[PDB]
Enzyme design. Structure first.
Site, mmCIF file in Angstrom:
data_model
loop_
_atom_site.group_PDB
_atom_site.id
_atom_site.type_symbol
_atom_site.label_atom_id
_atom_site.label_comp_id
_atom_site.label_asym_id
_atom_site.label_seq_id
_atom_site.Cartn_x
_atom_site.Cartn_y
_atom_site.Cartn_z
ATOM 1 N N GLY A 1 0.798 -1.204 0.000
ATOM 2 C CA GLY A 1 0.000 0.000 0.000
ATOM 3 C C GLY A 1 0.835 1.260 0.000
ATOM 4 N N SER B 1 5.537 -5.377 -0.642
ATOM 5 C CA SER B 1 5.696 -3.926 -0.588
ATOM 6 C C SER B 1 5.542 -3.498 0.869
ATOM 7 C CB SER B 1 4.733 -3.282 -1.561
ATOM 8 O OG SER B 1 4.836 -1.871 -1.501
ATOM 9 N N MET B 2 4.747 -2.480 1.168
ATOM 10 C CA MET B 2 4.614 -2.019 2.538
ATOM 11 C C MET B 2 3.938 -3.046 3.429
ATOM 12 S SD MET B 2 5.561 0.475 4.214
ATOM 13 C CE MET B 2 5.828 1.697 2.947
ATOM 14 N N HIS C 1 9.689 -4.567 -2.214
ATOM 15 C CA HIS C 1 10.113 -3.677 -3.297
ATOM 16 C C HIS C 1 9.518 -2.289 -3.082
ATOM 17 C CE1 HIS C 1 6.189 -4.961 -4.777
ATOM 18 N NE2 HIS C 1 6.182 -3.858 -5.505
ATOM 19 N N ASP D 1 12.576 -7.323 -7.678
ATOM 20 C CA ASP D 1 11.464 -8.123 -7.187
ATOM 21 C C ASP D 1 11.874 -9.581 -7.064
ATOM 22 O OD1 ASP D 1 10.036 -5.810 -7.224
ATOM 23 O OD2 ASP D 1 8.907 -6.281 -9.044
#
Lengths: 168, 165, 165, 165, 165, 165, 164, 165, 165, 165, 165, 165
Positions: free
Chosen positions: G50, G79-80, G104, G144
């Protein structure tokens, strides 16, 4: 209205079992012992069952208290409810003619919830406790608790859940 | 409001039968036994009918308690509703003149048995209390039919249709 | 709020008649009988009308209870609403001057009978309490017509239109 | 919140008049009669107006109850709203200085009569309580016109425009 | 949540003024009068403004009740919002330092009068309570202009800009 | 859910500031004053920023209430969001270590003034509470720049960046 | 439905992280602190990831509250999302056996700094909690790569892969 | 899809008749006239019925155009639907064997006339095209009755029930 | 579909008149002028009526173009709809037999004039083309009344009610 | 998507039958007739069943069109669904091996006839196309029973159960 | 459809002015120049008005092209709409009799200038083409006022109100 | 429509620049080269601006083709729009008098470079064609500022503001 029943030492487990219900009955279980430790407690059970942890809390207090707690199955007993039925005082566990008993234990949500029960291994305890009072071997208990089935009153007597079937 | 009726030993059964109601009925029955184990209990019935298992808990407790329980039908009584009407203490099971009575129905190796085996246990227990022969009961609980108060008397559900006074 | 009226033996019937209301009415009637079986019960009626079966349960219980029940129409009373108005204790069935009264209607081998047979049982029970001849009642409950308070008196639904004081 | 006002015998009429509100009003009126049948009832009115039949049920019950009912208009009162304002106990029907009052309207063999016959019954009952002649009322309820508090006094709807103190 | 404020005699006016809000305000005012007719009522105001007729019902009831009503503006108050601010009990009408105040506007033979006649009745009632001469008010309510708290004091809307403490 | 926090005197400001939120904030502040006028109020802030006028209503009410209000920034606080952060009770205005703070902007004879005059009133009120000189503030609120927690401390927005414990 | 879980001190993080969710998380954390400041908080995580700023507000509040917060990854966390997984209370940060973890990325004088400066602040805060050296983290968050539960343990994101 | 039918001079009337449909019908009729003013137009009808005024616009345009318009009922045709069926070019108005046909109905000084006067204009225009006497039509359009295809032929709505081939 | 009608110089006006439709009409009129400036233009009208300003743009362009424009009403034509009907080229303005025609209505210093001044400009332009005296037109456009085709002829809106052929 | 199937003369009937679907079916049938009046039409059927009147409109149009229509059942076909299956062009009415077929049912002087008379018209039209004797059909459509593909063949609903290839 | 008008050198401006329309206008102007650089261009205008920048692109291109461009207002022309009307080739700028014309308006260091500086550039360019003195134009474009065709002539927007012929 | 302009070697650039437009521009440029490689190409520009990469494809192709390309700004030209204006063939780059011109901006190891490196390549290519020094261009493309036609001439974007003729 439960109070006037409470005065006669009759306790009703009537619904899904949660901490709120468990806390209430535990409070009632203690309250009756304080009134008298000698006299019997009538525990009437109609439940689908519910949370496993809240079950033990009700179970232990039934074990911990001096008074004899009779269990009587009305309607359907399943999950924790059925567990509390076999947990009654020996010879004092009854069921009315038509009651249906299901000893299945659902696995249940998040795994972490599972994290503790599996960690809890309540089933083992659940299987252990149930096996001791029912007289059946642990293996048989382990199998049935994993299966969906419905025992009648009589079928619950031979299987060891209820000691009697009460006649009108 | 209900308590004041409960104090006079009247119990209203007002809606489809779930675990909530059945419990509330049972507790009241065991109550009215604890109050006085002699005087009979008036049990009114107006219901579309309800869950089977929750019905028995009302049935069995009627049998298990000492006092007589007079089932009085008013308005529709159907499915597990009538099955309580026909479960009243013999001779006291009533109806009001205009009320209507009706009767009908609600892993697969196990489930197919439990659905059948549960129904015979209704077919039997009506065969005693109506007196009709199972081969008739076996047929009636299958098909939907509307029994007026009188036609219920002839049928054996209700003993005495209560006439106004 | 209603209790304070209930304590004074007034019962409001305020909306279309379902199982919920009918039950709540019945329980109040059997209540007001348990309180005092002598003093009459004021029953107000303002309704568009409601389910048939739930209506009888109010009808029969009016008959089955001992006290007199004065039905007082206010505002519209229609369908099963008026049928309760006309069901009041004779001589006490009122209306207020401006109110309006109206009357009308709500496997196939069985269903076609039950819809017909249910209606005659309304046509009959109005024929007694209006006094009109069924050949007229048979016709009136079919077609929608708006009876003012007075025209209801002439018709036999209400005995005395209550004039303000 | 309303109860605390109800305990002081004030009744707010706050929105367009449906069966739900009218019932809630009626029950409160019969209540405040059961409490004390002497002290007058303050009835405030702010409404755009509402269903006709639900209006009468408020009208008739004002007449049918013993106590005096002081209608106090605040803000707009229109359609069946004002018709309650003009229905207050004579001499007590008020308005606040800035409020506005307004009056207007809401098988075919039968329906055409019922729509006409229902309106005369409004035209009449305003002709008494305004004192105006029907030939004027017949005309006013047809056309929309905004009567200030004072112009209502001259007109006969309100007796005394309440001045602040 | 609001009740706990209401118990302390604070009334929040939070949004554009419709019939729903105005009613809810009025009922609270008549309430706080019924509680205690002596202690003053704190009335906060933050509004973009609202319907005219629903505004008066708040205005008149402020005048009609006995207690003093302190209007406290916070944030924008415009259209019929400010007109309530300027309607507070004289000497108590406040504002917070950073708030802003603003004033402006919302068959044809009749409609053209009602739109004009309704506005003068705003132009007048502001002319008293601001003290300004109508020839100025007549001009101000026409054009949109943003009055800071202070510039409102000079203008006569608010008496005392409340400084933080 | 929020109430349980409100009971502990915490107020979450979670989204862009409209009239709906600002009102809901204000009401809670005046509430927590009515509860206890001594204990300080924890006000968290995470916002992209919001409407100007709705911001002041939160600002002024912070000043107008008696208790101390500790603004705690978490995550982004920008536009009128930070302007509330910098509006906290001096010495208590915090931030969490990783949060970011940022500051910037949202007939023509009148409109051009109102857009300018509204901004100085932000430039001023930040000049007090940051302590920076307007010639700097005048420049900063114009250009978009991302102040980390620490760089805000040096800047004068936040007093103490809260370190985890 | 969630309340009944909330009453048992479980918090589900179910979707990409926006201001709406992050707020709803934060409020629940400060809540569960107000309830009981002792018992630990179970925080499940299943997310694609997000918005950055909305992530920190969950991160910081985990640090700022007293109780321990056990992050339990289930299914993808990326991600987050993972950056919250790795932000759990040390020793309690879990994963389920089959779950996957991944990491990432999401005027120009200023904007070019803010995009860089925001990322180091992720590279740092992972360097503490994974223990890896920034020269590795600097490289990993760029490319990634799909870390299975176990390979995450070796990597330092999760302490204990929860076995059924 | 419809165009390809339109190119073959078929027009489907598929739903309750509003201004949108009626317009779309009219435009197609004037179209099919512009294409070829000789060849007849097949107009199918399946409708529950629709708004009166929007019906005439289909009726009149059928009359106003030169070509013959064959109304073919399929499935239910009721209210203003059948009134178009009976409006077809004489001799060509059909029905399919199993279809059903039915007929019925949809300031007060003026409104009561407009509702009556609008209906006679239906009662008349059916009296021509059915051939029945108004005293019968006056009665039929009032009461709801279900005419099978054949019973419609005898009645004069449809000339030839189309038998399958 | 419309083009094929447009090619034959027919223009359908099918719905309430907005800027979108009015534009689409205007463009078609100037078109049909560019095609042939001699042959007349058939303009059908079925409308509930529409925005005033968008109406004139259709009105003026009818006047401004060279060809004759035959307005043919079908079904309801009301408000600005009829005002186009009455705006047709004299002698050619038609109606179909069953259609209905009707006429009625849709800073304050300026706004009150613009609403009045806009209406006279309708009252005038109907006074020419109906021939009626403004004191009558002034009255008619105020009150809602339903003119049948014939009663419109007598009134001066339509010259020739088109009889079917 | 459907068009590309429609271009190949396949018509899917996918859900319970309302006026919307039935219309969409009818239009497609008359379409595929307009395309080519020779080649047969494949009509698939998967339905729980639908409204009666909307069913006939599909039935009659199957009969009324020239081409042969092959009904192919797939999955459940029940109530008015199967009644279309059995309505296919003789010899072509199919089913897939695993599909299931089933048949059953959906002022009072008139309504009781219309409900009965509507059903015989189903009982008849199945008696032709199944070939069974009405005394059997009269019984089958009453009771719910699940016919497998084969048992339907023996029964006369489907001619050839399509075996995979 | 528009092309056929475009071929005759008519350009419709039909709606609020965005980039899409303005472009489409510009391209048509440069087109009609490429066709014939002598014959004048008829430009009709009916608009509520549009975006400023998109307006100039129509304005400048009118100036930049060789041919004369006759702006003909029909119906409302307001905001940037009229500003194109007044931008026509002198002597040719028309209006139709009933049309209406109206004129009015649509980092902060820079933004406040751009909003002011953009408006003077409208105030100037109207001062040339109306001939009025800026001190008047400065005032008119601020306040909303409705100029009839004639009052526009006197004002200098339109040269010749086109009378019908 | 555009072709007829294209045939005269005019190319409209009308909207924000995407891959679709840029392609359509490029193809037209290479076209007008294939037609005649001598005569210059008029390129109008009205744009809010567009994607960077799609801009260059228009830029480079202007350079790569032989003919001169006269960029003529009309209305707003901003972002990558102006950058095409300033990219015209020197001496021919125009603007119309009232138009406005404006200039501004639209893994992380790589992405941060690509965003910077892409911008210098705009800063450079404007530094040649405006002649301004990069230290100024570096600053201008950062901040938003509105350059009138003239101020652009002084700035070096446009050579000759085209005056009307």
């Amino acid at each position: 209205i439960y109070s006037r029943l409470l005065k006669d030492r009759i306790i009703m487990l009537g619904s899904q079992i949660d901490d709120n219900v468990a806390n209430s009955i535990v409070s009632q279980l203690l309250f009756l012992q304080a009134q008298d430790s000698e006299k019997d407690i009538y525990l009437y059970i109609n439940s689908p069952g519910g949370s496993v942890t809240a079950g033990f809390a009700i179970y232990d207090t039934i074990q911990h208290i001096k008074p004899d707690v009779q269990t009587i199955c009305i309607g359907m007993a399943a999950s924790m409810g059925s567990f509390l039925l076999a947990a009654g005082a020996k010879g004092k566990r009854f069921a009315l003619p038509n009651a249906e008993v299901m000893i299945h234990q659902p696995l249940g949500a998040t795994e972490i919830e599972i994290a503790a029960n599996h960690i809890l291994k309540t089933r083992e305890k659940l299987n252990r406790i149930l096996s001791e009072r029912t007289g059946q071997s642990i293996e048989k208990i382990q199998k049935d608790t994993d299966r969906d089935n419905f025992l009648t009153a009589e079928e619950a007597k031979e299987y060891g859940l209820i000691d009697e079937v009460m006649v009108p």
